[PDB]
From a paper:
Crystals of the T2R‐TTL protein complex, containing two ɑ,β‐tubulin dimers, the stathmin‐protein RB3 and the tubulin tyrosine ligase TTL were grown as described by Prota et al. All of the tested ligands were bound to the maytansine site of the β‐tubulin chain in the T2R‐TTL complex. Maytansine site ligands bind at a shallow pocket at the top of the tubulin β‐subunit where the interaction with a longitudinal aligned tubulin dimer in the protofilament takes place, thereby inhibiting the addition of tubulin subunits at the plus ends of growing microtubules. According to the proposed mechanism of action, maytansine poisons the growing ends of MTs by occupying a pocket on β‐tubulin that is essential for the accommodation of helix H8 of the longitudinally aligned α‐tubulin molecules during MT growth.
Briefly, all compounds form hydrogen‐bonds between the C1‐O and the main chain nitrogen atom of Val181 and between the C24‐O and the side chains of Lys105 and Asn102. The heterocycle is anchored by two hydrogen bonds established between the C24‐O and the side‐chains of Asn102 and Lys105, which highlights that the interaction is not affected by the introduction of the double bond. However, the loss of one hydrogen bond between the C9‐OH group and the main chain carbonyl of Gly100 cannot fully account for the observed lower affinities and efficacies of these maytansinoids compared to their hydroxylated analogues, suggesting a contribution by other factors such as compound solubility or decreased stability. The series of compounds lacking the hydroxy group at position C9 showed binding affinities in the 1 μM range (2 720 nM, 3 830 nM, 5 a 1090 nM, 5 b 860 nM), thereby suggesting that the C9‐hydroxy group might serve as a critical anchoring point to allow establishing the interaction with the site. While compounds 4 a–c, 5 a, 5 b, and 6 a were strong inhibitors that completely abolished microtubule assembly, compounds 3, 5 c, and 7 a showed only a mild and compound 2  a weak inhibition. The corresponding signals of the compounds 3 and 6 did not undergo significant changes excluding an involvement of the hydroxy group.
Numbering used by the authors:
A (entry chain F): 1 to 103, 125 to 153, 159 to 175, 179 to 231, 236 to 362, 373 to 382
B (entry chain A): 1 to 438
C (entry chain E): 6 to 28, 44 to 74
D (entry chain B): 2 to 42, 45 to 277, 282 to 360, 369 to 437
Write the structure that this text describes.
Amino acid sequence: MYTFVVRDENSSVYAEVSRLLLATGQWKRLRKDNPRFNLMLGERNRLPFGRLGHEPGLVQLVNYYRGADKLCRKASLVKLIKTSPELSESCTWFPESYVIYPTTDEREVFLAAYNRRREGREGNVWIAKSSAGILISSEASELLDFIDEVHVIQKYLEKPLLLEPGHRKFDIRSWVLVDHLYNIYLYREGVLRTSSEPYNSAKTCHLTNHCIQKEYSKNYGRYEEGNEMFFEEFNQYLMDALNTTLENSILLQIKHIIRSCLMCIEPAISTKHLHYQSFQLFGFDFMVDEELKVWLIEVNGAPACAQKLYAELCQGIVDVAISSVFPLASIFIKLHHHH
Amino acid sequence: MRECISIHVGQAGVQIGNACWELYCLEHGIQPDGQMPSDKTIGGGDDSFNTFFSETGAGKHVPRAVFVDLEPTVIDEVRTGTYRQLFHPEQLITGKEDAANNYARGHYTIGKEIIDLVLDRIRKLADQCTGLQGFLVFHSFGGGTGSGFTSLLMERLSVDYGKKSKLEFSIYPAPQVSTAVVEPYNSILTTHTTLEHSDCAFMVDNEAIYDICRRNLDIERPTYTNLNRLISQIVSSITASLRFDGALNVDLTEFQTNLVPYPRIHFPLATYAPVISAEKAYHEQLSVAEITNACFEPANQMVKCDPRHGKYMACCLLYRGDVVPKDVNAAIATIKTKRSIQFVDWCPTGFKVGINYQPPTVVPGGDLAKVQRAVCMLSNTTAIAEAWARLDHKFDLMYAKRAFVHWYVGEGMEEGEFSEAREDMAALEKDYEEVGVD
Amino acid sequence: MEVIELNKCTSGQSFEVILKPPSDPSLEEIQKKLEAAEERRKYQEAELLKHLAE
Amino acid sequence: REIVHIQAGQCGNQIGAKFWEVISDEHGIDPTGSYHGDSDLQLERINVYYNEATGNKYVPRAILVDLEPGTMDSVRSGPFGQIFRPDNFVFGQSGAGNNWAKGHYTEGAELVDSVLDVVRKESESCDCLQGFQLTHSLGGGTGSGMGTLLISKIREEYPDRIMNTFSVMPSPKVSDTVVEPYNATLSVHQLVENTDETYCIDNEALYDICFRTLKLTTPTYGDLNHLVSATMSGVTTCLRFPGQLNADLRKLAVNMVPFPRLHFFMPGFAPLTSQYRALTVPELTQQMFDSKNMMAACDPRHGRYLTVAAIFRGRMSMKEVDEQMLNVQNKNSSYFVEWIPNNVKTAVCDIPPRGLKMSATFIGNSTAIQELFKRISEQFTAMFRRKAFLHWYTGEGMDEMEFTEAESNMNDLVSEYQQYQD
Ligand SMILES: Nc1nc2c(ncn2[C@@H]2O[C@H](COP(=O)(O)OP(=O)(O)OP(=O)(O)O)[C@@H](O)[C@H]2O)c(=O)[nH]1
Ligand SMILES: Nc1ncnc2c1ncn2[C@@H]1O[C@H](COP(=O)(O)OP(=O)(O)CP(=O)(O)O)[C@@H](O)[C@H]1O
Ligand SMILES: Nc1nc2c(ncn2[C@@H]2O[C@H](COP(=O)(O)OP(=O)(O)O)[C@@H](O)[C@H]2O)c(=O)[nH]1
Ligand SMILES: [Ca+2]
Ligand SMILES: [Ca+2]
Ligand SMILES: [Mg+2]
Ligand SMILES: [Mg+2]
Ligand SMILES: [Mg+2]
């Protein structure tokens, strides 16, 4: 009989994991402030990692990696990619980004590259965003004059891959689970969060966010249910249209990007020799251009799953992440690597 | 040559001090009867080891130490132990009724009755010093005497020896061997009133020592004797520079200069390696790189915490044995490119290294095996604040209900001192987070 | 990787390796608090003996 | 650090006598006071309960008090009767007639000063007096009425010493008179104010254990007293042998009493067999925490544990003891208050009790003890609402007001426990 606590009521993923654990008859939930727990479904902000692993006779596991915010923050991700030699200043799969603080800061460096785009004829449309409202302007003055009112200005993918019929944008969400041993498991099932409005290069058709599509989009749900296209359908489209497969044209790059990011921070966040163990579910978001090239947009540390996939994914979390540490009485693709 | 006086308070402090001085004698070649054949200057001298030992006309080397306990059973063992001849009765001070794990009882009630006697016995040792450096104070956080009487002694020492340094060796409470439920209370109370009076304090979490004994020594249920023998090794590595010829940490002042840029943040994290079981017939001797890399594994620290999620303010490497500077630098370069070692922007990213060629000494028949080389790292990292967070949380849980508070008020202590001490810890945690996080 | 201040002797040697440059209450006050605590003790004991006398 | 023992009344002296018989055997002391043991652990702390006399005789530091000579003549003629200091027999002739007022105000007042002279004589020769321990019942007149009078006067002369009692609670299952709820209610208030530690021994629980568990169809007081002997020996193990945890009365109180008035403990013992089988450490732990093995007749699952003191006796795996204790708390953490971290302390003693390879003693400060005070309070009110049997007490000078106050005092104690159970 194992024990666990719940310290994040707004978690839709682990609300299901909690429901599954209880149904096994071998897991007993405790009060959120009870220290004698085997497993903690911790809160998003200020999780007390310092208090974990100090219970004699208790193997303690938490569903978050301390220090993983380095990868799940707009400004943090940019700094980690520019400064880490593994990812290097030259990164073929990450859009050219810059960190700009409102009136270290990279304002002057952002204009230098911006000037070369103004100097020599090239697409000069950039996007400004922050972890907390986005602006897509081709003039640097409009972008900077907007941040004043921490942000990150990166190059806007002006030539994205457009699904037909529709001539519309989209992004790919991949769910990756990392267990206490730092095995990297990529969920076989992804989701394309598509835009129901045709792409106009001249903001509803540019932002593929689910909330924006459901409220601001007029043709919401016309092509696919909930502006969500799963891999089986997307793979068929790639074969019928472009005479290729999802695995070859996109999935190879995604698995490459996932490994590179997680292997980069592994020394900083690994709980191999630590007095408590950590696992965490990540939400990677990718953009695909017309050349069938994959770009990393951001990583989510507290992602929500697609409605149809909650059952399969949450069951997989229990199997490989929870029951592997606390055994009771594959839907993932293991991205092998050198520990 | 400048003398150092050791002060052992309470059961933990006395028994730990008993282990350290035993180890000191084995290292300096001093026999249980106080004789030291290698010492050619009879009845005097200003050698490095004379900072811890005085000399009699008969050639006896007497530790510059004082033992204080409110009940006599623990110090009686020293009076009739193997090294009973080292000390004279003036150095062993015992009462009759202990503090009953009550800080207020050791600080106010019982402490007031013996404070002047202890200071007088300390004054007798200070009068034998031509250039007293300061004091090394051993004690626990959880005991009523270790916590309560130490804070009173530290206050008075600042009054009588304002210019002298004071270092602490503090035993952090661990439930696996704890004897009282109120130890969180005593820990925070004694840290509050002692903070302004300690220049540098080395905390030792019994939890960490306990697991190191179970994990690396194969001790199923470690006892205090197992714990103290390992603790004395770490204490020995920290004081060796004061007892042997060298250039790093040669006086108590240098400890503060090298490890404590901020006075309040004066709790360096100690990490020791290797800890090898003497029961293994043969064990592959570890290299400089291997033992230096082990200084960055939490499993070898005196306090379990994650330095990766903090920032360093200083870092000293104390090697004992077959070690040469070239090997250290080679190990440091490798570790720097494989480890997460972040220093505060206003501090240089470097290491002060000290090497003593004499390899570590082990008590004959003990549990630690003889090794060709060992290292003790002293790193002032903000990560050690995790211990304060743990302690302060348990304090909050009990004090919210005023649980056990009547035991302290009954001794003349006011309930306001509780919140006053907790507020001081709250500020202490805030200082650490400012220096360590962005 | 700079090594500085190398000091050697028969029993060992020390040095410093740099990887990167940067970027009290008086005895009177104590006696008052100690005697103040003893006073609150005596007042509490006196009230107990008064209670027992009733 | 010496402890001064006091046993008052019939129940207090019959139980107190068995206690000295049990621990005298554990320390290797024979009926004549001569030591005949084989282990130095028997004599290392023999001073806590024994005085050393001429010829190397060990005389119990015990004071035997009663208002009738009956039970005390039985002790002096008992097995270990000759071991007690003759001067320490202080007794009257009238008796207390199961009347709290007689023991506390009339008959007892006449004799109390004689007892305090013997207590003073014993204390004067103590190097470092820990405190006192009293054995008595609450349903009678002498142990209940005069016992609490002694506690009040002892506290006045020794206010800085610990006061410990083993208090037998009355039960209609094992009852001598109908006025026992009156006597118990009047005494409980005295204990709430003037003791630091009180082991609540419920004659109802002792009876059920003898009947249901030990398979004794017709239990006698002797059978009940056998359980109390084993329990008293277990709870005092940490005081009588070398150890680190709860080694004296004050440190025990500091660990066990988070609030001054909530100092009433549920004792438990294991094993309880009707017998040559070896008991595993996991078995000791489960039985030790089982409600069927506790002496207060309260369901621990109806409340929460403020603090717990466990004592394992015998040669066993201390590693396995740590594992089992951690398994109890971690598997039933809801029954331990979370605002007192690590409120369970465990001690181990190498010397086991007589006739057992290993045993376990449980000492719990549970809020479920209120069920015992509620029970006494209901029985009290059933009679008091009709002022039934009060003439026995008003005839001794008491007023009904004093009964009303005792009633309100215990309902306050019940409310205080219910406060910390939520
Ligand atoms: N490492 C180590 N810790 C000890 C030792 N002795 C006691 N402790 C710890 O110290 C704490 C209790 O403090 P003590 O030193 O025993 O008590 P004290 O200082 O004598 O003060 P009193 O309450 O008056 O007895 C507990 O948490 C113990 O785990 C020891 O020999 N070694
Ligand atoms: N550099 C870029 N090039 C092209 N399109 C971009 C882009 N950056 C963002 N977008 C589009 O704008 C949206 C911004 O998504 P982003 O992840 O930054 O916001 P968000 O954190 O609120 C949603 P989530 O947390 O689920 O990823 C995406 O849907 C993407 O389609
Ligand atoms: N366990 C136990 N309880 C007893 C014994 N004798 C009396 N009692 C209980 O004590 C109460 C009577 O008190 P008693 O000691 O006889 O009165 P006293 O002599 O005037 O103090 C009743 O509730 C009895 O059940 C005994 O030998 N053992
Ligand atoms: Ca000399
Ligand atoms: Ca008369
Ligand atoms: Mg996001
Ligand atoms: Mg002590
Ligand atoms: Mg009777």
